[PDB]
Paper text:
Condensin protein complexes coordinate the formation of mitotic chromosomes and thereby ensure the successful segregation of replicated genomes. Here, we identify a direct DNA-binding site in the eukaryotic condensin complex, which is formed by its Ycg1Cnd3 HEAT-repeat and Brn1Cnd2 kleisin subunits. A peptide loop of the kleisin subunit encircles the bound DNA and, like a safety belt, prevents its dissociation. Firm closure of the kleisin loop around DNA is essential for the association of condensin complexes with chromosomes and their DNA-stimulated ATPase activity.
To gain detailed insight into the nature of the DNA binding site, we solved crystal structures of the Ycg1–Brn1 subcomplex of Saccharomyces cerevisiae (Sc) and of the homologous Cnd3–Cnd2 subcomplex of Schizosaccharomyces pombe (Sp) to 2.8 Å and 2.6 Å resolution, respectively. Both structures are strikingly similar and reveal a harp-shaped conformation of the HEAT-repeat subunit, with the kleisin subunit winding along the concave surface of the HEAT-repeat solenoid. The peculiar curvature of Ycg1 and Cnd3 has its cause in three discontinuities in the directionality of the solenoid formed by the 19 HEAT-repeat motifs. The Brn1 kleisin subunit makes extended contacts with the inner surface of the Ycg1 harp, burying a total surface area of 3,754 Å2. Through multiple hydrophobic, electrostatic, and hydrogen bond interactions with the HEAT-repeat subunit, Brn1 forms a rigid “bridge” between the two Ycg1 lobes. One of the two molecules in the asymmetric unit of the Ycg1–Brn1 and Cnd3–Cnd2 crystals shows additional electron density for a segment that corresponds to a long helix (α1) in the N-terminal region of the kleisin subunit. This helix and the succeeding well-ordered turn stack onto HEAT motifs 16 and 17 and onto the α4 segment of the kleisin via several highly conserved aromatic residues in a manner that resembles a “latch” that has been inserted into a “buckle”. The absence of density for the latch segment in half of the complexes suggests that the α2 to α4 segments of the kleisin subunit are sufficient for complex formation with the HEAT-repeat subunit. Mapping of the electrostatic surface potential onto the Sc Ycg1–Brn1 structure revealed that the wide groove between the two shoulders of the Ycg1 harp and the Brn1 bridge displays a high degree of positive surface charge.
Numbering used by the authors:
A (entry chain C): 458 to 521
B (entry chain A): 8 to 187, 205 to 401, 414 to 498, 556, 568 to 789, 793 to 816, 822 to 861, 864 to 881, ...
Amino acid sequence: VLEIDFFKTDDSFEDKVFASKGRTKIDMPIKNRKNDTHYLLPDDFHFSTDRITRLFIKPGQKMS
Amino acid sequence: DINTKIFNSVAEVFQKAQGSYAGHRKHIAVLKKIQSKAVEQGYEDAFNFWFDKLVTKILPLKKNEIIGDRIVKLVAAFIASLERELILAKKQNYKLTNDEEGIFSRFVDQFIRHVLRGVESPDKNVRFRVLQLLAVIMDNIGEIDESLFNLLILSLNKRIYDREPTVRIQAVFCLTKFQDEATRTLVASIQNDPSAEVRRAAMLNLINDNNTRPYILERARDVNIVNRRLVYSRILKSMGRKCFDDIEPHIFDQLIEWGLEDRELSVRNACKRLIAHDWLNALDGDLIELLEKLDVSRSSVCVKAIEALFQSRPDILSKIKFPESIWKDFTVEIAFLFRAIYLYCLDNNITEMLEENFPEASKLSEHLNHYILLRYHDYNTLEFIIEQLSIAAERYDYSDEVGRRSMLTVVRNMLALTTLSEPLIKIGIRVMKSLSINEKDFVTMAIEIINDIRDDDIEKQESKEASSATIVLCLTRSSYMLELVNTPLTENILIASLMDTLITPAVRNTAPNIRELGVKNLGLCCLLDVKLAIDNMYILGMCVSKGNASLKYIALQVIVDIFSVHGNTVVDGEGKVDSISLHKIFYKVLKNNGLPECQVIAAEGLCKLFLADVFTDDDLFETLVLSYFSPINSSNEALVQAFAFCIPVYCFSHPAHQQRMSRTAADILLRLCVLWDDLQSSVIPREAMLKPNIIFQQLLFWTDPRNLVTKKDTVQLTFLIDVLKIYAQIEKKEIKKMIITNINAIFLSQDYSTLKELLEYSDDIAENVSKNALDKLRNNLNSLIEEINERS
């Protein structure tokens, strides 16, 4: 905002920042904290149209 | 009084310090005097109290607000200033006489405790500011008693699991400064935390130690693209030369391959720049040494890495010439450059530097020959060099007829060597194809070679039939020859002889090595003569049924290719095998996870045939979709990815294809819900497969009309009604809730009859929120009804 008036002792309920929190959730749920995947991608084999259109034993030739 | 004077003095500083950093150094200077005098008069606690009060005013300010950022820096600069005076007196060894140590230790301790009063506040803004203040003063708090140290670690260890990723990052920054416990806590967050920005924060700030480097570089496969890019953009760049010493060579090669083959361009370019610009510069322009690090002899990544370099640095490209003097010191690195440059310039038509930088064909034939002599008259390096030169030779210029014959007589002598490795037969024959004027000139020279090998074998015997090893050589050569033939066998007589003399005997006997070559040679001939393919369909069915996993591997590929080239004319007729017989051969292989390599060929192969319309059986197509969603095939990544790429393009390429999915998809969905519900039973080998709602909206997605590459069609419509008849056939409502909620992904608008029928069912299902979801459907539906009705 504009600025802060650090000379204000009038400021009411500024100690509210130190409240207890009762029934306000501040921790992430314990389920998500650990994941077996470790957030990596699986092995990638790169299946492309170029891959499929080609023959197995004669990769130079293509099919429709 | 003097208590209010302290407040006014400190508040005046905070009032001006929030607006600009200009006078912060002066602001610290006065704060230190206000403090010193305050303690002199016994009001140390008045200063500490008012200093805290003014800091509380910035705690609720949100992350971005500059005013909060400016006061956080003031607080940090103040503590850092007080500590510097204590460090100097210690480092310059002079005494402090005004209790500066005691005042500092007490101020810091008191201030952290005050700030920690809001570490668990409900307002996420103060929780962020609290950890921000902590993070930015950690370096300058000095030595603290154990009670405060325990309080800090416990407070942070709870904030590492804060609900906001913004606070968690700040929790990370705090714990980084306690590294050497805290190190394992950060590795725990680098792998397990769901937010990508915190994994990024942990990664970038985690100490790069032999213990931690594996976990840091592990993020080269992070699901987020930035985290992957940053591995090359910063991590690997920070290390510099240590990327070739303190990094395991096996993971090293895997990092380049990953970056250069990544599916995203940002990651690819990031890895490219690391190789072409950052590394190369770290090695002082020495391209040869850079290639020594990539290890051309034991890796193919360098093909992309050097082409990546050539694009980035065309200035170096014109500087690599090849005079006759280079061959005196020819190594694997230089040899790889020879092919890499020559092929790169042909592809991008930089013919400028081929007439002056490379020898003519006649001189290249001498050098290629030379190395052939050294090897077949370190053996690995020689074979490698021969391969690199031969690769270039295949694409060399033989306009000068002198160079064509020279090179030709060189490779013919090479291919005549009975000891020639397979990789050098492969490339040796491809060169002879480029040198030949036409196919007939190519096969005549090739078969002439082959026959000499088998005939010479019969003189050592007449010191009857050729040895088994000798047959492996002839079939290896012929297999690479027949791969390059493209005319019907009717035109090539000599290939008809090779069939009788060599190929069909190889299919007859054993070991595999000789039988596997016979099948590949046969399959390649079947691609040229439809009748030959008809007359060998029974043989190939036997090869997969009675052969080792390797023979199944080849014979299956042959079968799929014969179908791709000739279609359904090799099946179902007089003198022809039955389609349903081959369908069973594929199915038996497809579901045998004992050998998963073959499942991909069956899985992929069948997709190739349905896509070309050569296959069009509804029941078989359904076996594919189910093997994709199957729990047994989760282990086979290649199979899942094969089906994942094929069956979506099948539907979306032509509505007849998608029309097939619609008829099956209801039965498919049925047979996977019944499945998952039975994975709860006491018979296992659940999360090993998707849950029905995923499967449904997956199925429904394939059936959507507009995803095809011109009218509404209602192909999807017919799928849904089927899904509703099957419905109600379930033990657990949980999966009924799954199937029902994911409706409304439909495209609705024609064809009155169908939609009215759809409404009739939905009304019948008017038997928990699932009810709402279904009601959403009928109101939208009932509108379509009155609209069409009144249209008349």
